[PDB]
Amino acid sequence: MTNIQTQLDNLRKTLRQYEYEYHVLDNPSVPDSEYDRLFHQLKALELEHPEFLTSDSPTQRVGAKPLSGFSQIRHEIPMLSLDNAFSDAEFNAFVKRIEDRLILLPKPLTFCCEPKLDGLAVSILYVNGELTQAATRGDGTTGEDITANIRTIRNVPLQLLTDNPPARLEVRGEVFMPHAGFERLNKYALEHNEKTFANPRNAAAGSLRQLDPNITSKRPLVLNAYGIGIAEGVDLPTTHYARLQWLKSIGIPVNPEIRLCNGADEVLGFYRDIQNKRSSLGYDIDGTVLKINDIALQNELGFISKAPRWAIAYKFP
Amino acid sequence: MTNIQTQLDNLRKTLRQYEYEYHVLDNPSVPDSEYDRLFHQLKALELEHPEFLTSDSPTQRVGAKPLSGFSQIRHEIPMLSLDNAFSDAEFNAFVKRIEDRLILLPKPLTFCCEPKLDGLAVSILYVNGELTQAATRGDGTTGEDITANIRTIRNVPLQLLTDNPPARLEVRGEVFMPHAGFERLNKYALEHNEKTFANPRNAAAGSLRQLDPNITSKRPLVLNAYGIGIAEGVDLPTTHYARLQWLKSIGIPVNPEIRLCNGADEVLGFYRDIQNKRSSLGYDIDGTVLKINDIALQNELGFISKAPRWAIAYKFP
Numbered sequence: 001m002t003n004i005q006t007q008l009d010n011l012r013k014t015l016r017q018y019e020y021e022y023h024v025l026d027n028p029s030v031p032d033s034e035y036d037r038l039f040h041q042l043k044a045l046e047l048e049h050p051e052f053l054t055s056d057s058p059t060q061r062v063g064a065k066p067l068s069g070f071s072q073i074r075h076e077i078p079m080l081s082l083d084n085a086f087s088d089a090e091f092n093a094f095v096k097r098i099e100d101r102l103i104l105l106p107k108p109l110t111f112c113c114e115p116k117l118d119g120l121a122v123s124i125l126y127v128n129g130e131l132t133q134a135a136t137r138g139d140g141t142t143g144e145d146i147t148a149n150i151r152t153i154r155n156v157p158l159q160l161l162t163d164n165p166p167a168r169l170e171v172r173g174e175v176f177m178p179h180a181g182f183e184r185l186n187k188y189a190l191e192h193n194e195k196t197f198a199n200p201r202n203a204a205a206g207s208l209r210q211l212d213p214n215i216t217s218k219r220p221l222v223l224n225a226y227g228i229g230i231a232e233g234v235d236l237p238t239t240h241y242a243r244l245q246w247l248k249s250i251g252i253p254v255n256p257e258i259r260l261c262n263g264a265d266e267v268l269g270f271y272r273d274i275q276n277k278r279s280s281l282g283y284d285i286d287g288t289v290l291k292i293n294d295i296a297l298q299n300e301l302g303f304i305s306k307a308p309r310w311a312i313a314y315k316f317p
Numbered sequence: 318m319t320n321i322q323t324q325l326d327n328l329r330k331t332l333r334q335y336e337y338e339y340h341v342l343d344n345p346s347v348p349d350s351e352y353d354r355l356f357h358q359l360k361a362l363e364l365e366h367p368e369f370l371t372s373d374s375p376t377q378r379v380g381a382k383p384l385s386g387f388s389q390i391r392h393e394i395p396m397l398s399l400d401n402a403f404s405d406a407e408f409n410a411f412v413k414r415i416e417d418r419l420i421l422l423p424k425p426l427t428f429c430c431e432p433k434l435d436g437l438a439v440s441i442l443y444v445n446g447e448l449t450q451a452a453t454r455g456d457g458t459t460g461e462d463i464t465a466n467i468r469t470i471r472n473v474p475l476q477l478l479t480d481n482p483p484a485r486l487e488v489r490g491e492v493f494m495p496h497a498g499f500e501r502l503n504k505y506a507l508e509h510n511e512k513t514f515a516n517p518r519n520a521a522a523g524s525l526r527q528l529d530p531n532i533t534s535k536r537p538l539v540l541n542a543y544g545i546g547i548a549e550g551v552d553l554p555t556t557h558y559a560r561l562q563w564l565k566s567i568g569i570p571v572n573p574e575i576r577l578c579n580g581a582d583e584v585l586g587f588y589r590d591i592q593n594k595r596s597s598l599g600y601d602i603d604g605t606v607l608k609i610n611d612i613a614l615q616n617e618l619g620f621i622s623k624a625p626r627w628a629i630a631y632k633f634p
């Protein structure tokens with residue numbers, strides 16, 4: 001035991017906890033100045049005792065060197081996109097289809113309802129609680145390695161906030177740029193004779209395809225987790241909403257507008273409520289993602305790859 | 318001009334025409350013995366004058382040498398699979414969804430209704446009327462090069478039957494093994510202490526993954542074309558059914574049970590009629606493939622890749 005090792009450990013724990021309160025709970029227990037005091041105390045002590053510097057320390061989010069190019073990552077589990085609907089009647093047709101298709105239709109049929117964030121879909125792998133890799137969705141089978149860029153995102157923990165993390169956990173979510181950060185970015189870019197972005201989605205896409213993580217760090221990106229891919233060494237909750245509450249409880253940011261709704265009519269009320277809040281959210285949304293909450297029912301229903309909306313195979317019983 | 322070149326040309330034309338009548342029209346104008354007389358007259362003349370032997374001659378379906386392994390082919394246009402339905406109510410939900418989603422719903426809504434063949438999906442490319450390449454569907458993006466095996470299939474023309482073939486035409490269909498051929502294959506395999514096949518789909522899959530085309534040739538495989546991929550240098554018909562009538566008119570085999578139906582009720586009558594004929598067809602089917610007939614409506618409706626059946630994005634207008 002040394003006093004330096006203990007001070008480093010204590011500072012790291014305290015800082016990760018403050019990052020959780022600020023970023024995930026939106027309820028910081030200390031002012032930003034106090035967080036920064038401890039942050040640059042940690043940074044200086046590590047630099048004076050580099051034998052104790054860890055790769056997942058709060059001070060190590062930015063790789064000091066730009067990359068040459070992005071490597072490709074093949075997802076172990078396919079990463080899905082979403083089919084869409086443009087009206088209440090079309091949404092009702094989607095529900096009616098599920099109701100007939102299910103072996104046993106529960107009473108009620110519960111949906112996890114989420115805002116549809118207009119950003120870039122990503123996969124972030126935690127091995128024994130440590131962030132080891134991150135990839136873009138790509139085509140759903142293969143994506144690009146954006147690990148270094150994802151590490152710069154302030155609300156993405158470099159380590160899970162739990163003493164018993166799973167052996168492996170893949171978090172899936174959307175990276176997006178809120179309105180305030182987007183407005184600042186364009187003001188700065190116009191002042192410094194640099195290129196402006198047309199909308200926050202383009203700004204987030206561009207920021208994540210940047211090869212220098214020093215540049216990504218200056219871009220105000222945020223993650224909101226919406227699902228789980230790989231999960232080894234953990235009994236994941238059996239409902240989608242509980243899985244999200246679980247990710248939040250171990251350090252992962254989740255959108256606070258998510259709600260449970262029973263049946264199509266309550267779901268359409270959620271859709272209208274979010275449609276009315278659009279103006280007040282502070283980030284861009286495209287619509288709502290409506291998900292069957294029960295995981296066993298998701299597994300039964302399954303997914304479809306490269307299928308026309310203009311044809312169907314009516315199978316014989 | 319030489320008399321040998323003229324005799325070879327005449328024999329090839331006559332044989333390709335008889336192959337069309339026998340395989341595509343199911344209405345041969347001559348007996349099998351007459352077709353064979355001309356066939357082995359062509360084969361002998363080519364072998365006595367090998368300078369005039371062509372790669373697309375009716376006698377050149379079987380590459381005399383097995384391959385080492387299958388090469389991979391990336392489809393230029395994605396090759397689609399089908400979503401499915403298990404009841405009238407589920408099928409009606411699929412139609413109701415289309416009716417609401419379309420900008421303008423026509424009166425009537427016409428469907429091209431086909432039996433769902435239980436075989437292997439393939440892509441066959443014709444360049445200036447010549448069969449140059451064939452691939453399995455694979456994952457819809459990449460498949461295996463099965464050109465040599467596809468050339469052995471008796472009802473697959475090595476050249477299109479038209480004096481003005483498109484610059485490029487990609488035929489998509491199902492390769493399957495009819496009941497009679499399947500029964501013969503298993504009888505022969507059991508007699509010759511060889512492995513039997515559980516069902517015709519397995520027999521067709523196995524036959525197409527064979528590396529020696531000499532073995533594929535002895536397997537009674539059939540193509541039925543169900544669509545078109547690439548098409549350059551041709552104004553394709555604007556309805557799916559007319560595109561199939563067009564493929565038939567230029568030498569490609571198409572299933573004769575295909576019909577046009579107006580609205581969901583007529584479509585369900587087609588489904589019940591085919592379900593009753595199952596016993597009498599002479600090949601295995603899984604159900605029916607029901608397609609929006611209008612090509613512009615197919616283009617408007619589009620397709621979905623890797624999407625859950627348990628979620629939807631209701632987009633804001």
Ligand SMILES: Cc1ccc(Cn2cc(C(N)=O)ccc2=O)c(C)c1
Pocket residue numbers: 018019021022023028029030031032033035036154
């Ligand atoms: C100078 C400075 C330091 C920190 C922050 C924001 N913030 C605050 C906390 C906190 N209060 O626990 C934790 C992490 C964090 O990123 C800003 C915007 C500016």
Ligand SMILES: Cc1ccc(Cn2cc(C(N)=O)ccc2=O)c(C)c1
Pocket residue numbers: 335336338339340345346347348349350352353471
């Ligand atoms: C000996 C032999 C020759 C031909 C056939 C079948 N067949 C017939 C014709 C035909 N009638 O125009 C054309 C092609 C073809 O494959 C069988 C089964 C047996």
Ligand SMILES: NC(=O)n1nc(-c2ccco2)nc1N
Pocket residue numbers: 080081082114115116117118119174226227289628
């Ligand atoms: N974009 C967005 O906000 N998404 N996307 C999904 C998604 C994609 C596939 C499954 O779920 N869920 C949410 N909230």
Ligand SMILES: NC(=O)n1nc(-c2ccco2)nc1N
Pocket residue numbers: 311397398399431432433434435436491543544606
């Ligand atoms: N298997 C079968 O008989 N199919 N498959 C299609 C298909 C697959 C994608 C588009 O169409 N059409 C028919 N008749």
